[PDB]
Ligand binder design. Structure first.
Ligand code: SF4
Ligand code: SF4
Ligand code: SF4
Ligand code: SF4
Ligand code: FES
Ligand code: K
Ligand code: ZN
Lengths: 114, 86, 117, 208, 95, 48, 688, 51, 126
């Protein structure tokens, strides 16, 4: 059960890195909104950042959240420079996607998908 | 408004259901001679825990755990559920 | 040996050469060939649907060499650019019309070429 | 046997087996297996913890001189607990030799970067991340290099499907290209082509 | 010879005709439905029956390597003419 | 072909047609298979 | 220890005496090539492909027919073994016709596969091949005798398992043809299985002929529902369309064989389907509508009815998930009137104990018995694989078979006791010597068919056979773990309905007439509108519109057995799960989804929405329905015997006549077979 | 068994038609084993690591 | 020490990039495939396989192909042993069911029993 750590020895260091990554993302969000002449507000983008951060919050393995911290830092670094277009930033907002049925009755009406 | 069916689950080989089996080997037949129109479904399995499910009117169901019960305790619980009619 | 527009040939008696053996759709590296078959009225084993997606095909000539009866041939035509996407999605009737149109030169080409195969 | 069979080499097999014995007896800390294939190729299966020294040995020994780095390949075998097989290919110009170094690594555990041994791997293992998710510690610049920027997941893993999870199409309402769930016009027809008969008797696994 | 279903749309040699209530016929209006005017079963229906004097005949489609692989046909049954499985030609024994 | 004419066949076109793309006589793809699953026809008389 | 050690390729292995070379080579995980050997057929030893070399022995022996001895070393990869294999392959391919593109065996051909693996790469035969006259042996098996290799699996299958004795080998030398020598229409309950055992394309499936190719077919494993044997099958599909049905290797039920109904029901499965909900309009005609309108109308009529005014009927092709969903939905409205098409006697113990409605021993338990008594059944048509197992025990274990009823053909020889029910009173007393015969039997078996229980004296017959079984078991020297009493069912959904607490028989509906009736695939037409009042909201919920659809007020389309993940229990109490092969056509949905959505419209929604939660509810009702591929012993025979003696019925004088007598009545059993043109062709071909 | 036979011999011999069938539908069975074969492409070393 | 004792559950569902709809509404099936009954070969029944349930495939309105919307319909994985496949199923968070390996029972074959003196296993013809 003994494994080799990546960057964080325990859960607390991974939590601290999560905090630092969220701080950097919260710093960047207004500049990202202004740079790409986005149609969203600042608070909508920060709400999206929070929604991703809380969607990816049910895992307690330090190595898993360490890898997720590294991937989020790559995302942050890619948004630091002008490497993405407007499309790659706007991909997080599923706007053109039609809302799928969620309750059982509409899912029964539309097809066989559970 | 009244019970409609009785379901008794047991295992063939495990000792925990053994006292439940001691009921079936002794006092089940007179029970079917007492309430002929009340379906008492006996269900054997391989490794399940002893249980007693009773269905009432309008889909109401109650559960009784018969784990490590002797024959007389099983008889007491079963006479309680048939005489309840909650 | 030029590889161009696909065509379906015929025997010198009027009957279609293909016997729905599904070798060309199994050997196709782009999966552009779709074959659906049923035994027809006289009991002969013939195709009911032979579809070649020319926008999917890479013009590699595996179907023209895997065919044991020389039914499908990568013909000599190359001037068949279309103005619409669905005109490049050939069914069996378009391929058979291409074969009837170009048989007078595909037969000569295969007669000149078959000794190398 | 003579006309239609590829001829076998035995002096190269002997020299490769001798050098494999020499390597396995010169670095007993990290080497686990040494094999010579039928077509005279030497493969050294070593522990991940010796990713840096062993290759460095092959970079700097007088009798090895494996100066050139040819490949850095990751193989995904899902049936093992260490599902990733990191393989280095080395070429020695002085002795004109080729060697293969194999190590095992799962998804979460990292491996030390071989930038300080060969700088070409500074790109190569980068692509490995972009294709496999195998993290390389102490890499100078590790990010995606081949896939799209908003790509989620790693494509070359064997549980990843052939077609992706998203497709790009242009919408005039947002005046932009957008990603949608994948809906193919024709399903990729899976062909069952595995023979039900045994092909090679010398390659038979023992029964369970 | 093709047939004519009473919607005005021609009949393919397979037997595929869109119904009167099928909307896909809107892909044909303003254009044409390309069919084959040479039906294979009708084209082979006028071929003569080759009468041979051997119990086992061999067919390769003519031309050697330009035809179908060589197949042997038995003509023992005088009730039914032996029909080649590839080219569709049929042979009959004189006896 | 003035000295080596092509072999005459009963099915070879007697009128060569060029690229008719963009014309009203162009090619339209369609499925050449019949209906797969049949449907249950309800009866024409009432249940009374 | 009597086992001896032999050597294969220099490796020791421990085998039993009497074990051939090929069985030892399979024990060390290798496959010797073969054409005529079969693990379920007798050894012929004529194809000569299995030739191997024993070391220090200058003659090759046939591995399929040579018993091993101690100290033997077998070389399966030597030079002379490969030379013999290449020679036999060349001889086999000398006269084989060039028909591979136009042959259905291509892609799954044994001859091609072992020609690539072990044969040579070119043919030295420069002469003219032979040509064999074709034969017409029925409307199911397309026959082209030119491609045969005279493997004689036809002959052994027709003479040993089917037991019809119609096929033979006519002529001498290379001109010998495998046929019937006359225009004999070979028709039996297990004919199509020869298409399984032909290694070449000589015999093919006529409906499947020239339709598909095995390399482009996805295989999805499933369970047969046409009969109550519970055959494990696989479905080969091509691009979302059902192409063909093959058996699966399950040694306990249907070892590698299936009946013809399972093999050719897919043509009926793809015809006469229900694709869209239909409701009665003002004119009384069934007209198309939306799902929500039909569900709203059914729920609106359902909320008014309460108590005995609503009832349900279970069909023969309905899984336990839809059954428990409808049972809980009708228990939300306080209605216990749940009925099945097949009639089972509820007198005495009834459906409480599982001992009196199961094949209590096993399907394979017939391999252990020595005396089997059949009462009022025709197992050659009701359960063909059960009869095949009985024939296998009668052939190998020297089983003794005696039948009560009409003297039908059962592909073997039995003892016809009689047809009146009173013969049971002669057995339960001890007048005939057959009572002494089962008294002296070590492992006796009493089998009662469910078709005899359809009569008006099913309770009397069940009481008589139970009295016989408990007279034998309590007096003769039986071990006790041997279960004598057995009940053979002919409906797939019967055991699942009985295990769920349903009330078998339609008596509760004709007693108190309901005002709103459910027809969960009630294709048998058990109750007509005449037995019901003037205005009944009859709702049919099924895939095939056969009988109840023209009389229903609302038609709800459903999913067949290949279009849903469904739980079915066979006649021996073993639970199995089917898998999704294709989608229901049109707007048809899964049945339990329809019931749950109907309850959601009606305001009485059930506490489960996903399939695993439905299976959890099934486990809550009875766990035996959720543990798949496991048989649980049904005990307490003495209590059921004591309860059956409380009330005594009188046996009538009607002879025990099964509803099926000839092969004509075998193809017409369910709604799936009633929409099949292949079965219509079979009926037409056997009625001439 | 590796290279397909000629078209003139696949229409006369039985073994040539069988080997033409399997090679163009299933494909030849390559034995297990990993190799790295590199040639001198005009750009440089072009190698394929095949498993 | 450079080693940390972690007893947490091995879950990498958030690292594979799969959308949630395909990790909770799918049923992974671990099974040994059945032998094709038209062939006597058993080489395809030596490795365990992981497969997914078939979703909806409909017909293309234009030309009539099999158009699907399920990305995992052509994803079949091969594993040497059952426990490794079970670990891989638990690792990706797929709800899974396992069917046991149906080994054929060892039959008893005898060539002499076809010519028995009194038994019923005589061959009617040969
Ligand atoms: S040329 Fe190649 S890619 Fe094109 S249809 Fe033929 S086999 Fe397919
Ligand atoms: S390979 Fe030739 S004969 Fe076979 S299906 Fe294709 S076109 Fe027809
Ligand atoms: S049975 Fe004969 S014709 Fe058919 S695939 Fe096999 S070898 Fe070819
Ligand atoms: S037809 Fe097939 S199963 Fe019958 S004897 Fe010939 S090869 Fe054997
Ligand atoms: S398998 Fe032994 S001779 Fe045929
Ligand atoms: K066959
Ligand atoms: Zn011919």
């Amino acid at each position: 059960t003994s494994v080799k750590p990546i960057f964080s020895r325990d859960m607390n260091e991974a939590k601290r890195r999560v905090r630092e990554l969220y701080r950097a993302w919260y710093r960047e969000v207004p500049n990202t909104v202004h740079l790409f002449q986005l149609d969203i507000s600042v608070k909508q983008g920060r709400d999206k950042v929070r929604e991703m951060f809380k969607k990816n919050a049910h895992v307690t393995d330090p190595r898993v959240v360490d890898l997720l911290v590294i991937k989020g830092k790559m995302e942050l670094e890619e948004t630091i420079n002008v490497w993405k277009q407007r499309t790659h930033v706007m991909r997080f907002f599923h706007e053109t996607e039609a809302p799928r049925p969620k309750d059982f009755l509409s899912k029964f009406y539309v097809g066989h998908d559970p | 408004l009244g019970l409609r069916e009785i379901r008794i689950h047991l295992c063939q080989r495990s000792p925990g259901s053994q006292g439940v089996r001691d009921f079936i080997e002794k006092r089940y037949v007179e029970l079917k001679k007492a309430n002929p129109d009340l379906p008492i479904l006996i269900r054997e399995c391989s490794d399940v825990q002893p249980k007693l499910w009773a269905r009432y009117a309008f889909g109401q169901e109650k559960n009784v755990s018969l784990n490590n019960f002797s024959a007389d305790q099983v008889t007491r619980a079963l006479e309680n559920v048939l005489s309840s009619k909650a | 040996r030029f590889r161009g527009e696909h065509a379906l040939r015929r025997y010198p008696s009027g009957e279609e050469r293909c016997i729905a053996c599904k070798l060309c759709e199994a050997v196709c590296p782009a999966q552009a060939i779709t074959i659906e078959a049923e035994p027809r009225a006289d009991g002969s084993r013939r195709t009911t649907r032979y579809d070649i997606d020319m926008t999917k095909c890479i013009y590699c000539g595996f179907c023209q060499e895997a065919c044991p009866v020389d039914a499908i041939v990568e013909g000599p035509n190359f001037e068949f650019s279309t103005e619409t996407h669905e005109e490049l999605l050939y069914n069996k009737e378009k391929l058979l019309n291409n074969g009837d149109k170009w048989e007078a030169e595909i037969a000569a080409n295969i007669q000149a070429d078959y000794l190398y195969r | 046997t003579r006309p239609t069979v590829r001829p076998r080499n035995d002096v190269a097999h002997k020299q490769l087996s001798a050098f494999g014995e020499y390597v396995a007896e010169i670095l007993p800390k990290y080497v686990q297996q040494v094999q010579v294939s039928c077509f005279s190729e030497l493969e050294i299966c070593i522990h991940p913890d010796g990713v840096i020294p062993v290759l460095t040995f092959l970079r700097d020994h007088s009798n090895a001189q494996f100066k050139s780095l040819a490949d850095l390949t990751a193989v995904d075998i899902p049936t093992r607990q260490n599902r990733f097989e990191i393989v280095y290919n080395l070429l020695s110009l002085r002795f004109n030799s080729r060697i293969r170094v194999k190590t095992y690594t799962d998804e979460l555990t990292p491996v030390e970067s071989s930038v300080s041994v060969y700088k070409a791997a500074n790109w190569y293992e980068r692509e490995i991340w972009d294709m496999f998710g195998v993290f390389f510690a102490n890499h100078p610049d590790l990010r995606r290099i081949l896939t799209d920027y908003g790509f989620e997941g790693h494509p070359f893993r064997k549980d990843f499907p052939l077609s992706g999870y998203v497709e790009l199409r242009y919408d005039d309402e947002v005046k932009r290209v957008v990603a949608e769930p994948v809906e193919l016009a024709q399903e990729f027809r899976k062909f069952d082509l595995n023979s039900p008969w045994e092909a090679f008797p010398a390659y038979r696994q023992p029964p369970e | 010879g093709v047939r004519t279903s009473p919607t005005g749309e021609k009949v393919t040699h397979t037997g595929q005709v869109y119904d009167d209530e099928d909307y896909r016929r809107v892909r044909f209006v303003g254009r044409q439905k390309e069919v084959n005017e040479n039906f294979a079963i009708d084209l082979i229906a006028e071929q003569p029956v080759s009468q041979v004097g051997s119990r086992v005949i061999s067919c390769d489609g003519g031309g050697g390597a330009l035809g179908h692989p060589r197949v042997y046909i038995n003509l023992d049954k005088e009730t039914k003419t032996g029909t080649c499985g590839y080219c569709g030609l049929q042979f009959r024994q004189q006896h | 072909p003035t000295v080596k004419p092509p072999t005459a066949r009963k099915f070879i076109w007697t009128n060569h047609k060029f690229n008719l793309s963009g014309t009203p006589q162009q090619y339209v793809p369609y499925s050449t298979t019949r209906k797969k699953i049949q449907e249950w026809v309800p009866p024409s008389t009432p249940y009374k | 220890s009597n086992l001896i050690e032999v050597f294969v390729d220099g490796q020791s292995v421990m085998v039993e005496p009497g074990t051939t070379v090929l069985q030892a080579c399979e024990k060390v995980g290798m496959q010797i090539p073969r054409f005529c050997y079969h693990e379920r057929l007798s050894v012929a030893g004529n194809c000569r492909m299995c030739l191997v070399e024993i070391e220090k022995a200058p003659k090759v022996v046939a591995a399929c027919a040579m018993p091993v001895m101690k100290g033997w070393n077998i070389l399966t990869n030597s030079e002379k073994t490969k030379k013999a294999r290449e020679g036999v392959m060349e001889f086999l391919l000398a006269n084989h016709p060039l028909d591979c593109p136009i042959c259905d065996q291509g892609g799954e051909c044994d001859l091609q596969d072992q020609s690539m693996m072990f044969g040579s790469d070119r043919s030295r035969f420069l002469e003219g091949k032979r040509a064999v006259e074709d034969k017409n042996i029925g409307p199911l098996v397309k026959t082209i005798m030119t491609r045969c290799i005279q493997c004689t699996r036809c002959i052994r299958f027709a003479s040993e398992i089917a037991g019809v004795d119609d096929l033979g080998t006519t002529g001498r030398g290379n001109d010998m043809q495998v046929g019937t020598y006359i225009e004999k229409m070979f028709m039996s309950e297990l004919s199509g299985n020869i298409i399984d055992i032909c290694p070449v394309g000589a015999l093919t499936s006529k409906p499947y002929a020239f339709t598909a190719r095995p390399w482009e077919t996805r295989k999805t494993e499933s369970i047969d529902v046409m009969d109550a044997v519970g055959s494990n099958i696989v479905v080969s599909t091509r691009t979302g369309e059902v192409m063909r049905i093959l058996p699966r290797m399950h040694e306990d039920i249907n070892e590698e064989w299936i009946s013809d109904k399972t093999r050719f029901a897919y043509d009926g499965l793809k015809r006469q389907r229900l694709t869209e909900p239909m409701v009665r309009n003002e004119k009384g005609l069934l007209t198309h509508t939306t799902w929500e309108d039909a569900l709203s109308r059914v729920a609106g009529m359902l909320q008014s009815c309460q108590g005995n005014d609503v009832a349900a009927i279970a069909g023969g092709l309905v899984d336990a998930e839809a059954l428990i969903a409808l049972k809980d939905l009708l228990n939300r409205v306080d209605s216990d009137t749940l009925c099945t098409e097949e009639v089972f006697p509820t007198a005495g113990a009834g459906t409480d104990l599982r001992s009196n409605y199961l094949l209590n021993t096993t399907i394979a338990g017939v391999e252990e018995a020595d005396v089997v008594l059949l009462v009022g059944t025709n197992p050659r048509f009701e359960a063909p694989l059960f009869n095949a197992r009985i024939r296998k025990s009668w052939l190998h274990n020297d089983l003794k078979v005696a039948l009560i009823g009409s003297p039908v053909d059962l592909t073997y020889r039995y003892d016809h006791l009689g047809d009146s029910p009173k013969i049971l009173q002669d057995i339960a007393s001890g007048s005939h010597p057959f009572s002494q015969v089962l008294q002296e039997a070590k492992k006796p078996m009493v089998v009662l068919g469910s078709s005899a229980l359809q009569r008006n004296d099913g309770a009397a017959i069940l009481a008589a056979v139970s009295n016989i079984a408990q007279k034998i078991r309590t007096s003769s020297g039986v071990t006790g773990d041997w279960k004598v009493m057995n009940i053979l069912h002919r409906i797939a959904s019967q055991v699942a309905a009985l295990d769920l607490g349903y009330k078998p028989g339609v008596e509760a509906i004709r007693k108190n007439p309901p005002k709103m009736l459910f027809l969960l695939g009630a294709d048998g037409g058990c109750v007509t509108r005449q037995d019901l009042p003037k205005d009944c909201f009859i709702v049919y919920q099924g895939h095939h519109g056969d009988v109840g659809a023209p009389i229903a007020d609302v038609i709800l389309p459903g999913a067949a057995y290949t279009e849903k993940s469904a739980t079915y229990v066979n006649t021996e109490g073993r639970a199995q799960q089917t898998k999704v092969a294709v989608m229901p056509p049109g707007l048809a949905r899964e049945d339990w989804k329809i019931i749950r959505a109907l309850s959601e419209i009606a305001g009485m929604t059930l506490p489960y929405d996903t399939l695993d939660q439905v299976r959890n509810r099934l486990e809550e009702v009875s766990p035996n329905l959720v543990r798949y591929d496991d048989v649980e012993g049904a005990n307490y025979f003495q209590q059921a015997s004591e309860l059956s003696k409380l009330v005594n019925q009188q046996l009538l004088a009607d002879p025990l006549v099964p509803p099926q007598l000839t092969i004509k009545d075998f193809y017409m059993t369910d709604s799936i077979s009633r929409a099949s043109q292949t079965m219509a062709k079979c009926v037409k071909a056997v009625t001439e | 068994k590796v290279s397909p036979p000629k078209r003139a011999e696949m229409k006369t011999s039985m073994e040539s038609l069988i080997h033409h069938f399997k090679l163009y539908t299933e494909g030849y069975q390559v034995p297990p084993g990993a190799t790295y074969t590199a040639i001198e492409a005009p750009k440089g070393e072009f190698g394929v690591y095949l498993v | 020490t450079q080693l940390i004792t972690v007893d947490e559950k091995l879950d990498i569902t958030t690292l594979t990039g799969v959308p949630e709809e395909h990790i909770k509404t799918r049923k992974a099936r671990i099974f040994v495939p059945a032998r094709n009954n038209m062939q006597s070969g058993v080489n395809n029944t030596k490795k365990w396989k992981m497969e997914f349930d078939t979703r909806e495939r409909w017909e293309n309105p234009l030309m009539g192909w099999a158009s699907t919307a399920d990305p995992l319909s052509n994803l079949v994985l091969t594993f040497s042993t059952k426990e490794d496949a079970i670990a891989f199923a638990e690792k990706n968070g797929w709800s899974y069911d396992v069917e046991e390996r149906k080994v054929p029972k060892p039959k008893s074959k005898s060539y002499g029993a076809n010519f028995s003196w009194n038994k019923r296993t005589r061959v009617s013809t040969k």
